Design an enzyme around this catalytic site. Structure first.
Site, PDB file in Angstrom:
ATOM      1  N   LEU A 274       0.802  -1.216   0.000  1.00 53.92           N
ATOM      2  CA  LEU A 274       0.000   0.000   0.000  1.00 53.92           C
ATOM      3  C   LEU A 274       0.836   1.267   0.000  1.00 53.92           C
ATOM      4  CD1 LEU A 274      -2.766  -0.909   2.564  1.00 53.92           C
ATOM      5  CD2 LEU A 274      -2.989  -0.732   0.066  1.00 53.92           C
TER       6      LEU A 274
ATOM      7  N   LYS B 284       5.146   2.840   0.849  1.00 48.84           N
ATOM      8  CA  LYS B 284       6.526   2.642   1.269  1.00 48.84           C
ATOM      9  C   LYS B 284       7.144   3.962   1.724  1.00 48.84           C
ATOM     10  CE  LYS B 284       8.999  -0.706   0.133  1.00 48.84           C
ATOM     11  NZ  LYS B 284       8.353  -1.810   0.915  1.00 48.84           N
ATOM     12  N   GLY B 285       7.592   3.989   3.001  1.00 47.89           N
ATOM     13  CA  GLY B 285       8.304   5.079   3.663  1.00 47.89           C
ATOM     14  C   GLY B 285       9.778   4.792   3.929  1.00 47.89           C
ATOM     15  N   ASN B 286      10.434   5.339   4.952  1.00 47.37           N
ATOM     16  CA  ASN B 286      11.870   5.059   4.970  1.00 47.37           C
ATOM     17  C   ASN B 286      12.252   3.948   5.969  1.00 47.37           C
ATOM     18  OD1 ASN B 286      11.167   7.075   6.704  1.00 47.37           O
ATOM     19  ND2 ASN B 286      12.046   8.849   5.536  1.00 47.37           N
ATOM     20  N   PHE B 287      11.466   3.667   7.017  1.00 49.09           N
ATOM     21  CA  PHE B 287      12.039   2.643   7.885  1.00 49.09           C
ATOM     22  C   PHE B 287      11.233   1.353   7.786  1.00 49.09           C
ATOM     23  CE2 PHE B 287       8.846   2.776  11.056  1.00 49.09           C
ATOM     24  CZ  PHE B 287       8.475   4.061  11.304  1.00 49.09           C
ATOM     25  N   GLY B 288      10.019   1.436   7.244  1.00 48.79           N
ATOM     26  CA  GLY B 288       9.064   0.363   7.090  1.00 48.79           C
ATOM     27  C   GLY B 288       8.137   0.621   5.915  1.00 48.79           C
ATOM     28  N   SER B 289       7.097  -0.202   5.817  1.00 45.51           N
ATOM     29  CA  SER B 289       6.131  -0.160   4.728  1.00 45.51           C
ATOM     30  C   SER B 289       4.800  -0.673   5.255  1.00 45.51           C
ATOM     31  CB  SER B 289       6.598  -0.977   3.521  1.00 45.51           C
ATOM     32  OG  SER B 289       6.755  -2.351   3.855  1.00 45.51           O
TER      33      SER B 289
ATOM     34  N   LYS C  87       1.663  -2.379   9.042  1.00 46.58           N
ATOM     35  CA  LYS C  87       2.934  -1.676   8.995  1.00 46.58           C
ATOM     36  C   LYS C  87       4.040  -2.559   9.552  1.00 46.58           C
ATOM     37  CE  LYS C  87       5.100   2.788   9.642  1.00 46.58           C
ATOM     38  NZ  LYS C  87       5.231   4.034  10.459  1.00 46.58           N
TER      39      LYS C  87
ATOM     40  N   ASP D  41       5.845  15.111  11.127  1.00 48.54           N
ATOM     41  CA  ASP D  41       5.835  14.743   9.714  1.00 48.54           C
ATOM     42  C   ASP D  41       4.448  14.971   9.111  1.00 48.54           C
ATOM     43  OD1 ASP D  41       7.306  14.017   7.476  1.00 48.54           O
ATOM     44  OD2 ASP D  41       6.987  11.861   7.754  1.00 48.54           O
TER      45      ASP D  41
HETATM   46  N1  LIG Z   1      -0.204   7.835   6.293  1.00 48.53           N
HETATM   47  C1  LIG Z   1       0.602   7.452   5.587  1.00 48.53           C
HETATM   48  C2  LIG Z   1       1.705   6.865   4.706  1.00 48.53           C
HETATM   49  C3  LIG Z   1       1.917   5.368   4.918  1.00 48.53           C
HETATM   50  C4  LIG Z   1       3.244   4.972   4.277  1.00 48.53           C
HETATM   51  C5  LIG Z   1       3.647   3.440   4.778  1.00 48.53           C
HETATM   52  C6  LIG Z   1       4.739   3.519   5.595  1.00 48.53           C
HETATM   53  C7  LIG Z   1       4.941   5.066   5.912  1.00 48.53           C
HETATM   54  C8  LIG Z   1       4.232   5.811   4.704  1.00 48.53           C
HETATM   55  N2  LIG Z   1       0.818   4.658   4.294  1.00 48.53           N
HETATM   56  C9  LIG Z   1      -0.310   4.348   4.899  1.00 48.53           C
HETATM   57  C10 LIG Z   1      -1.133   3.688   3.974  1.00 48.53           C
HETATM   58  C11 LIG Z   1      -2.547   3.148   4.222  1.00 48.53           C
HETATM   59  N3  LIG Z   1      -3.458   3.004   3.247  1.00 48.53           N
HETATM   60  C12 LIG Z   1      -4.717   2.544   3.436  1.00 48.53           C
HETATM   61  N4  LIG Z   1      -5.745   2.424   2.338  1.00 48.53           N
HETATM   62  C13 LIG Z   1      -5.225   2.488   0.940  1.00 48.53           C
HETATM   63  C14 LIG Z   1      -3.908   2.836   0.632  1.00 48.53           C
HETATM   64  C15 LIG Z   1      -3.399   2.883  -0.655  1.00 48.53           C
HETATM   65  C16 LIG Z   1      -4.246   2.572  -1.697  1.00 48.53           C
HETATM   66  C17 LIG Z   1      -3.730   2.631  -3.129  1.00 48.53           C
HETATM   67  C18 LIG Z   1      -4.722   3.330  -3.984  1.00 48.53           C
HETATM   68  C19 LIG Z   1      -4.460   3.144  -5.474  1.00 48.53           C
HETATM   69  N5  LIG Z   1      -4.322   1.710  -5.822  1.00 48.53           N
HETATM   70  C20 LIG Z   1      -3.272   1.037  -5.021  1.00 48.53           C
HETATM   71  C21 LIG Z   1      -3.487   1.223  -3.521  1.00 48.53           C
HETATM   72  C22 LIG Z   1      -5.568   2.217  -1.432  1.00 48.53           C
HETATM   73  C23 LIG Z   1      -6.046   2.172  -0.130  1.00 48.53           C
HETATM   74  N6  LIG Z   1      -5.042   2.228   4.676  1.00 48.53           N
HETATM   75  C24 LIG Z   1      -4.179   2.358   5.732  1.00 48.53           C
HETATM   76  N7  LIG Z   1      -4.322   2.098   7.067  1.00 48.53           N
HETATM   77  C25 LIG Z   1      -3.200   2.371   7.724  1.00 48.53           C
HETATM   78  C26 LIG Z   1      -2.280   2.829   6.801  1.00 48.53           C
HETATM   79  C27 LIG Z   1      -2.909   2.819   5.537  1.00 48.53           C
HETATM   80  C28 LIG Z   1      -0.374   3.662   2.792  1.00 48.53           C
HETATM   81  N8  LIG Z   1       0.798   4.254   3.023  1.00 48.53           N
END
Ligand SMILES: N#CC[C@H](C1CCCC1)n1cc(-c2nc(Nc3ccc(C4CCNCC4)cc3)nc3[nH]ccc23)cn1
Length: 289
Positions: A13, A15-20, A40, A134
């Site tokens: 879903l 990707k950040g710098n220390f985890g995903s 995460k 952040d």
């Molecule tokens: N803040 C923040 C940033 C954080 C990063 C991870 C590590 C640090 C930064 N990060 C949190 C989420 C996330 N996304 C969702 N939904 C969701 C997400 C993406 C899509 C895309 C849409 C287009 N097609 C492909 C999929 C669809 C639905 N739900 C979540 N719950 C908790 C986190 C979370 C994603 N990156």
């Protein structure tokens, strides 16, 4: 409370710098009745990174607010390695990509709704004496067309009780274009630096995430693209301490731009509070409606 056995990987879903973060399905009955959650994880497990991830997990567990992503549980092995944080899955993704792919259906009133929601979340963070450090649209998630949520806390710190700032410099590099000047110069992080960053978030929202209009693009076309390395930061410093600022975004009312500039006050004590911001934003939204 979640067993890793039963977590079924679907996709990545973010990707950040220390985890995903992975979209997975918790399905203990193994019949695709389980629910889709976000997980995460860490990209490298030092004990520094492990202890900071545990502190972040306990921070998110202590939060409950309609604009904060919902902690669900933890999952691990074998052992106490492979630590993973379970959260609710938000299905519209980050506010950055959502706004950049729907720019023709989100008017200023919906951006002001998002803005006030962010301010309520940030004020709730402040009442617990947390510094987010952040605040950016890449760190805001979308629950539905009417609700957004703060969705990452990997850098959040708790203030000591005798002081109101937090001095910390991390290894690796930093989103310096969202940083208040005192956080570039002395590494001081406080509620007022979060207010500076929120001003930047407001700028982002009203640029609709145009690629040429990003804060890095604007700032390094203001200082010149020839600067490289540490010197960049240095130049940025002086640019900010001469009241050089991001320009007013295209189509942004002057009322909003003045909120932005008031959050970019160099004097860290003359910045607005998150409650005053929510008040002014709500009054503007009501004047528009
Ligand atoms: N803040 C923040 C940033 C954080 C990063 C991870 C590590 C640090 C930064 N990060 C949190 C989420 C996330 N996304 C969702 N939904 C969701 C997400 C993406 C899509 C895309 C849409 C287009 N097609 C492909 C999929 C669809 C639905 N739900 C979540 N719950 C908790 C986190 C979370 C994603 N990156």
């Amino acid at each position: 409370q979640f067993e890793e056995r039963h977590l079924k990987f679907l996709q990545q879903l973010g990707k950040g710098n220390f985890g995903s973060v992975e979209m997975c399905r918790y399905d203990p009955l193994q019949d695709n009745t389980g629910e889709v959650v976000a997980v995460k994880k860490l990209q490298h497990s030092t004990e520094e990174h492990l202890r900071d991830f545990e502190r972040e997990i306990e921070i998110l567990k202590s939060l409950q607010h309609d604009n904060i992503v919902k902690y669900k549980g933890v999952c691990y092995s074998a052992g106490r390695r492979n630590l993973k944080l379970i959260m609710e899955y938000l299905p519209y993704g980050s506010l950055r990509d959502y706004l950049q792919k729907h720019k023709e259906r989100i008017d200023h009133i919906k951006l002001l709704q998002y803005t006030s929601q962010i301010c309520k979340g940030m004020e709730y963070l402040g009442t617990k004496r947390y510094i987010h450090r952040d605040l950016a649209t890449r760190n805001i998630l979308v629950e539905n067309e009417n609700r957004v949520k703060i969705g990452d806390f990997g850098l959040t710190k708790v203030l000591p009780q005798d002081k109101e700032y937090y001095k910390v410099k991390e290894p690796g590099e930093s989103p310096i274009f969202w940083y208040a000047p005192e956080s570039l110069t002395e590494s001081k992080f406080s509620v007022a630096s979060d207010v500076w960053s929120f001003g930047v978030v407001l700028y982002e929202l009203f640029t609709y995430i145009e690629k040429s209009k990003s804060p890095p693009a604007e700032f390094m076309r203001m200082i010149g693209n020839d600067k490289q390395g540490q010197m960049i930061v240095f130049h940025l410093i002086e640019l900010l301490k001469n009241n050089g600022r991001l320009p007013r975004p295209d189509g942004c009312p002057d009322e909003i731009y003045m909120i932005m500039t008031e959050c970019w006050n160099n004097n860290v004590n003359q910045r607005p509070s998150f409650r005053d911001l929510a008040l002014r934003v709500d009054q503007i939204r009501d004047n528009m409606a």
